[PDB]
Amino acid sequence: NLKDKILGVAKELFIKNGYNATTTGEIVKLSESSKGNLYYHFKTKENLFLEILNIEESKWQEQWKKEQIKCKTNREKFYLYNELSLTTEYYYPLQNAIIEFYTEYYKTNSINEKMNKLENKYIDAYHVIFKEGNLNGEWSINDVNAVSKIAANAVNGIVTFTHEQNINERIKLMNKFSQIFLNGLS
Amino acid sequence: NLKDKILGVAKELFIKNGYNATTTGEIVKLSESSKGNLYYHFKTKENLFLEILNIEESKWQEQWKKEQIKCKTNREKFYLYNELSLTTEYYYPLQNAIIEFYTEYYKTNSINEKMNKLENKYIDAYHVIFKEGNLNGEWSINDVNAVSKIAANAVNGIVTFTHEQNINERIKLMNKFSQIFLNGLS
Ligand SMILES: CC[n+]1c(-c2ccccc2)c2cc(N)ccc2c2ccc(N)cc21
Numbered sequence: 627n628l629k630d631k632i633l634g635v636a637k638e639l640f641i642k643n644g645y646n647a648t649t650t651g652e653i654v655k656l657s658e659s660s661k662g663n664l665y666y667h668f669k670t671k672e673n674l675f676l677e678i679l680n681i682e683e684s685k686w687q688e689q690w691k692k693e694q695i696k697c698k699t700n701r702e703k704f705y706l707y708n709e710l711s712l713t714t715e716y717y718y719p720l721q722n723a724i725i726e727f728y729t730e731y732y733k734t735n736s737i738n739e740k741m742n743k744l745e746n747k748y749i750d751a752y753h754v755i756f757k758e759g760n761l762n763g764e765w766s767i768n769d770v771n772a773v774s775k776i777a778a779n780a781v782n783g784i785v786t787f788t789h790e791q792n793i794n795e796r797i798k799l800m801n802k803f804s805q806i807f808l809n810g811l812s
Numbered sequence: 813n814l815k816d817k818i819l820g821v822a823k824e825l826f827i828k829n830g831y832n833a834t835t836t837g838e839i840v841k842l843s844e845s846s847k848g849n850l851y852y853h854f855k856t857k858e859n860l861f862l863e864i865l866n867i868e869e870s871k872w873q874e875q876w877k878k879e880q881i882k883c884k885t886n887r888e889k890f891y892l893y894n895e896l897s898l899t900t901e902y903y904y905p906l907q908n909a910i911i912e913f914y915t916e917y918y919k920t921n922s923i924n925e926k927m928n929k930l931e932n933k934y935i936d937a938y939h940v941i942f943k944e945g946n947l948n949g950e951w952s953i954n955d956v957n958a959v960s961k962i963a964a965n966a967v968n969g970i971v972t973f974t975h976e977q978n979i980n981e982r983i984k985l986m987n988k989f990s991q992i993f994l995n996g997l998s
Pocket residue numbers: 722725786787788789910911914915917918931934964965968972
């Protein structure tokens with residue numbers, strides 16, 4: 627594909643290097659396509675990137691729907707979502723590239739904008755889990771949005787800043803966390 | 813001292829031009845030293861930078877040693893310390909050179925090894941709050957080292973991935989989080 631092989635080499639470059647480490651010269655070299663092509667659906671580098679973020683956030687949110695049935699209760703969905711977070715091939719592997727990118731465009735205006743419709747997909751998962759959990763007496767949480775946001779970020783932290791120690795310790799810690807967290811809501 | 817003048821000049825350069833832009837040539841000239849002396853004291857830019865980082869951790873440890881006096885109980889030191897990490901990174905100049913550096917040296921083992929004897933120092937603060945909290949029966953944690961690795965990374969997550977919200981909100985969340993986490997140990 628054309629408008630898609632671009633996004634493909636893109637996602638990869640952004641992961642295998644950094645947000646800046648990969649420049650348009652590169653995309654149009656490994657994806658092969660006149661600089662112009664990169665101008666339709668992608669009105670900028672921050673578009674090509676803020677684009678992939680949406681795909682990714684989606685591919686994951688979907689993989690999660692197709693894997694969350696293994697969780698009978700929400701207290702179980704909480705643990706599961708967090709544990710899966712550690713192993714997907716989606717979204718979470720671009721957290722570094724995002725940190726970077728948000729430190730080099732957070733000045734522009736449309737930065738804190740797209741980072742809204744996207745931030746809502748991101749904390750959705752927890753939102754559903756914590757809300758559906760009040761309807762299920764599992765716990766009682768007045769400020770759901772707060773907690774979703776907290777949990778989403780805490781988790782992303784555990785996932786991102788420990789991506790160096792053996793996968794089994796990572797999942798071990800993440801569970802102790804999910805454990806401590808939920809025990810804090812009741 | 814010529815060693816110290818190099819660390820000083822280099823810090824400033826990294827802060828103004830960033831990690832990538834600062835060459836060792838500049839560092840050598842502005843500190844009135846030589847490629848040889850620099851090589852002898854640090855070997856590489858990556859090492860130079862990690863040494864700056866080590867020194868920064870220390871000043872931060874010392875700063876904490878004084879600040880915590882404000883916090884009588886460890887429950888308090890926990891809340892406090894999390895708030896400090898939040899607010900202080902907000903206006904921490906090296907922060908950008910740091911991002912730029914980490915997301916560019918987490919594959920290498922040279923930079924992945926020393927980068928961890930460093931992270932360990934950050935984690936120790938929590939280690940202490942937690943160990944000491946046990947002896948005062950504020951809580952009872954049988955796995956202090958783990959709970960520590962968790963707090964450390966859960967917190968950076970909230971610090972690092974909430975940058976799009978206004979400061980009071982961020983601090984509101986961080987305190988809510990400290991509240992929940994501390995509650996799940998009870
Ligand atoms: C896992 C290390 N680590 C920390 C870090 C985490 C806990 C304590 C000290 C530093 C980090 C902290 C901030 N603010 C921003 C980016 C990074 C980062 C980025 C990439 C990477 N590969 C490791 C990274």
